[PDB]
Amino acid sequence: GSSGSSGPAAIIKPLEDQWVAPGEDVELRCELSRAGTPVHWLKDRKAIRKSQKYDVVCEGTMAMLVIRGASLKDAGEYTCEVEASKSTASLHVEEKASGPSSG
Protein backbone atom coordinates (compact mmCIF):
# COMPACT_ATOMS: atom_id res chain seq x y z
CA GLY A 1 0.00 0.00 0.00
CA SER A 2 1.39 3.35 -1.12
CA SER A 3 0.08 6.11 1.15
CA GLY A 4 0.35 9.83 0.45
CA SER A 5 -0.61 10.87 -3.07
CA SER A 6 2.33 10.54 -5.45
CA GLY A 7 4.55 13.61 -5.60
CA PRO A 8 8.37 13.52 -5.58
CA ALA A 9 10.70 16.46 -4.94
CA ALA A 10 12.96 16.06 -7.97
CA ILE A 11 14.37 19.10 -9.75
CA ILE A 12 12.42 20.18 -12.84
CA LYS A 13 14.12 23.53 -13.41
CA PRO A 14 17.91 23.01 -13.58
CA LEU A 15 20.40 25.82 -12.95
CA GLU A 16 22.22 27.74 -15.68
CA ASP A 17 25.56 29.39 -16.45
CA GLN A 18 25.84 32.70 -14.62
CA TRP A 19 28.10 35.57 -15.67
CA VAL A 20 29.13 38.07 -12.99
CA ALA A 21 32.14 40.08 -11.83
CA PRO A 22 34.73 39.40 -9.10
CA GLY A 23 32.94 40.97 -6.15
CA GLU A 24 29.25 40.68 -7.00
CA ASP A 25 26.65 38.45 -5.35
CA VAL A 26 25.52 35.33 -7.20
CA GLU A 27 22.09 33.74 -6.76
CA LEU A 28 21.38 30.26 -8.13
CA ARG A 29 17.66 29.48 -7.89
CA CYS A 30 15.92 26.24 -8.84
CA GLU A 31 12.60 24.40 -8.84
CA LEU A 32 11.45 21.21 -7.11
CA SER A 33 8.38 19.04 -7.66
CA ARG A 34 7.88 19.38 -3.91
CA ALA A 35 8.87 21.65 -1.02
CA GLY A 36 10.55 20.81 2.27
CA THR A 37 13.36 18.81 0.68
CA PRO A 38 17.07 18.69 1.59
CA VAL A 39 19.68 19.88 -0.91
CA HIS A 40 23.43 19.45 -1.42
CA TRP A 41 25.49 22.24 -2.98
CA LEU A 42 28.72 20.85 -4.44
CA LYS A 43 31.30 23.36 -5.67
CA ASP A 44 34.29 21.95 -7.56
CA ARG A 45 33.57 18.44 -6.28
CA LYS A 46 33.54 19.81 -2.73
CA ALA A 47 30.78 19.69 -0.12
CA ILE A 48 29.56 23.18 0.80
CA ARG A 49 28.22 24.23 4.19
CA LYS A 50 25.50 26.83 4.73
CA SER A 51 27.21 29.91 6.17
CA GLN A 52 27.53 33.69 5.93
CA LYS A 53 29.08 33.17 2.49
CA TYR A 54 26.69 30.50 1.23
CA ASP A 55 23.12 31.40 2.19
CA VAL A 56 20.90 28.39 1.45
CA VAL A 57 17.46 29.91 0.91
CA CYS A 58 15.04 26.99 0.60
CA GLU A 59 11.68 28.58 -0.18
CA GLY A 60 8.48 27.33 -1.80
CA THR A 61 9.85 24.62 -4.08
CA MET A 62 12.78 26.97 -4.68
CA ALA A 63 16.43 26.49 -3.71
CA MET A 64 18.55 29.63 -3.93
CA LEU A 65 22.25 29.87 -3.06
CA VAL A 66 23.76 33.28 -2.32
CA ILE A 67 27.52 33.44 -2.89
CA ARG A 68 28.52 36.67 -1.14
CA GLY A 69 31.52 38.24 -2.84
CA ALA A 70 32.08 35.85 -5.73
CA SER A 71 35.77 36.01 -6.65
CA LEU A 72 37.42 34.54 -9.74
CA LYS A 73 37.91 31.44 -7.59
CA ASP A 74 34.26 31.16 -6.55
CA ALA A 75 33.80 30.13 -10.18
CA GLY A 76 33.16 26.39 -10.37
CA GLU A 77 30.76 23.57 -11.17
CA TYR A 78 27.68 23.76 -8.95
CA THR A 79 26.00 20.36 -8.63
CA CYS A 80 22.60 20.45 -6.93
CA GLU A 81 22.43 16.92 -5.53
CA VAL A 82 18.79 16.49 -4.50
CA GLU A 83 16.87 13.48 -3.19
CA ALA A 84 17.20 11.56 -6.45
CA SER A 85 17.45 14.30 -9.08
CA LYS A 86 20.55 16.36 -9.85
CA SER A 87 21.45 19.61 -11.61
CA THR A 88 24.82 20.77 -12.95
CA ALA A 89 25.97 24.24 -13.99
CA SER A 90 29.06 26.38 -14.59
CA LEU A 91 29.67 29.70 -12.83
CA HIS A 92 31.68 32.50 -14.43
CA VAL A 93 33.55 35.48 -12.98
CA GLU A 94 35.63 38.05 -14.85
CA GLU A 95 36.89 41.52 -13.94
CA LYS A 96 35.40 44.54 -15.71
CA ALA A 97 37.39 46.92 -17.91
CA SER A 98 36.63 49.82 -15.57
CA GLY A 99 37.90 49.12 -12.06
CA PRO A 100 40.75 49.40 -9.53
CA SER A 101 42.99 47.40 -11.85
CA SER A 102 43.09 45.36 -15.06
CA GLY A 103 44.88 42.24 -16.29
Task: Give the start-to-end residue ranges of the domains of the chain.
Answer: 1-103
Q: Do 16 and 80 touch, CB atoms closer than 8 A?
A: no
Q: Do 25 and 70 touch, CB atoms closer than 8 A?
A: yes
Alpha-carbon distance 39 to 5, whole Å?
22
For this PDB entry, the determination method is NMR
Alpha-carbon distance 21 to 55, whole Å?
19
Looking at CATH, the fold of the domain delimited by 1-103 is given as Immunoglobulin-like (2.60.40)
CB atoms within 10 A of CB 73: 10
CB atoms within 10 A of CB 96: 10
